[PDB]
Amino acid sequence: HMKNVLLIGARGALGRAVANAFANGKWSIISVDQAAAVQQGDECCAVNPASSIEELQQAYKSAVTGLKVDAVINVAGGWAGGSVADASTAASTELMLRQSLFSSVAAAHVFSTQGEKNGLLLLTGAAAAVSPTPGMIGYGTAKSAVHFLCQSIAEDPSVLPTDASVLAILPTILDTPGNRSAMPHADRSTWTSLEDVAQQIVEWSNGSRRPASGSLVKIVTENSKTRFIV
Amino acid sequence: HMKNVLLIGARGALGRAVANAFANGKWSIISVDQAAAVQQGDECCAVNPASSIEELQQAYKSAVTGLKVDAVINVAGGWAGGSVADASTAASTELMLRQSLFSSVAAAHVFSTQGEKNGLLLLTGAAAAVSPTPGMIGYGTAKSAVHFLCQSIAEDPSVLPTDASVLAILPTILDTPGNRSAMPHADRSTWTSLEDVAQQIVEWSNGSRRPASGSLVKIVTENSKTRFIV
Numbered sequence: 076h077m078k079n080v081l082l083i084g085a086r087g088a089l090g091r092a093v094a095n096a097f098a099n100g101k102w103s104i105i106s107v108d109q110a111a112a113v114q115q116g117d118e119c120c121a122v123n124p125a126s127s128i129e130e131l132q133q134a135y136k137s138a139v140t141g142l143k144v145d146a147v148i149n150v151a152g153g154w155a156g157g158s159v160a161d162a163s164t165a166a167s168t169e170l171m172l173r174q175s176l177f178s179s180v181a182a183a184h185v186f187s188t189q190g191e192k193n194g195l196l197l198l199t200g201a202a203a204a205v206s207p208t209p210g211m212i213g214y215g216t217a218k219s220a221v222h223f224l225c226q227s228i229a230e231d232p233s234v235l236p237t238d239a240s241v242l243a244i245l246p247t248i249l250d251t252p253g254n255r256s257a258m259p260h261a262d263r264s265t266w267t268s269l270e271d272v273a274q275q276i277v278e279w280s281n282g283s284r285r286p287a288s289g290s291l292v293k294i295v296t297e298n299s300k301t302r303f304i305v
Numbered sequence: 306h307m308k309n310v311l312l313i314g315a316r317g318a319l320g321r322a323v324a325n326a327f328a329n330g331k332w333s334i335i336s337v338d339q340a341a342a343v344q345q346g347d348e349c350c351a352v353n354p355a356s357s358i359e360e361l362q363q364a365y366k367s368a369v370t371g372l373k374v375d376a377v378i379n380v381a382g383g384w385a386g387g388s389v390a391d392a393s394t395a396a397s398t399e400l401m402l403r404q405s406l407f408s409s410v411a412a413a414h415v416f417s418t419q420g421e422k423n424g425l426l427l428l429t430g431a432a433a434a435v436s437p438t439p440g441m442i443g444y445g446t447a448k449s450a451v452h453f454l455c456q457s458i459a460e461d462p463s464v465l466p467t468d469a470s471v472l473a474i475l476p477t478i479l480d481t482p483g484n485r486s487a488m489p490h491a492d493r494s495t496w497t498s499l500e501d502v503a504q505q506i507v508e509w510s511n512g513s514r515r516p517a518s519g520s521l522v523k524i525v526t527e528n529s530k531t532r533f534i535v
Contacts, residue, residue: 127395132392165358166357209458223450
């Protein structure tokens, strides 16, 4: 368990896949999640969903005190729909901002100050958020902001450990319990396996060849085969 | 005073310029500002700086109850610097998000539901936020998100009144009391006059020719002359 990873969103479907892929292992895993950490048998930090970015930052700093972190992995966030015509868009956009953007700003600061040389900061965007998202204002605005944050971090590498990388993954559709439940009978040939994403995150984290720091990495599945593409 | 404008950020330097340009007039002005509304002699709604997007939305809906709004103008927001290396970036990024993005999501919903035909939704971006902003993470991420929001609104015009427009202004440098104070002796030849921006917002609001709904409008000043450019 020589290498250290801070895992944000550890209790979501993609978070559990990522924790499973770490633990090979080789890795010591420090996990955090908002509201949704069952806080029973789980060795996961529960942080309040009403947390400020500064509160997230302090909670993350605390969880890894006196560690060099090789990887900070943020795979937090769910989904909601809504246009500006919908009253519901106000709350859903704030929720998506908190889950994805607040967590990513705090996570970047911990990686900057406690990251190890050759380490990885990985954030979670959305392939759809590369374009206007009139029907998913919250989801698209939050994820677009994560993409922007990824690019801005990379633009000044002096803020990262030596030879560190930041990457954002842009999933299209993930094969999650939620999606299976929603559409039991659907053609899932374009639905990316969580194990495939998790395994790729752990290789990148281990210092396999990575796309250029700053890359938006689209996760494209056809006939149940997956490419990681810039 | 036939036409109605909801003005968000009315107590900032650009907000006062915009209120002055309305009042020609011809316009009935309903103004809102966070923390900074002096709430003495001022006919301005003071909204709490800790407001949720839904709270902003309700406060905006209340301020214009039983009006058709020809214009919703959001010129709120200040500035802070900071990279991900800075502990201060967490709080400054949340502050910029609240001032600019929270206000813009709420303002878009009020314009969708209470806007008049041929009306204007105007948001405030930043010319610099078209590119990575490693040295101003908060400011750039918040403003980039406003640009994205502007584009997403325009992408589905069924959410807006008939022949309505949304625009985002991308200032580079504004000739504000704050900037004059900071650099009394500086060459201000590239600093845009607030009166010039305000006057252009009021013409667009009145239904002058506008760039295409969705435009990011850069405000470019050289030798103290200004162009509004896409």
